[PDB]
Amino acid sequence: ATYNGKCYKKDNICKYKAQSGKTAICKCYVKKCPRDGAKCEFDSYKGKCYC
């Protein structure tokens, strides 16, 4: 149920359109974003930010 979006290094966050548009930006927990736009998925099993 993992999603897909982008993450920002500068803002070290993970932005993506939740499966229902509910979720949203999610700090790039661990391994800060590589570069703005960096694709990332939102694991709906824990709530991390695969970036």
Swiss-Prot record:
It is found in: Secreted; Host cytoplasm. The keyword Disulfide bond applies. GO terms for cellular component: extracellular region; host cell cytoplasm. Keywords: Antimicrobial, Disulfide bond, Fungicide, Host cytoplasm, Secreted, Signal. Its main location: secreted. GO terms for biological process: defense response to fungus; killing of cells of another organism. Disulfide bonds join 7-33, 14-40, 26-28, 49-51. Antifungal protein that acts as an inhibitor of growth of a variety of fungal species. Belongs to the antifungal protein pafB family. This is Antifungal protein. It comes from Aspergillus giganteus.
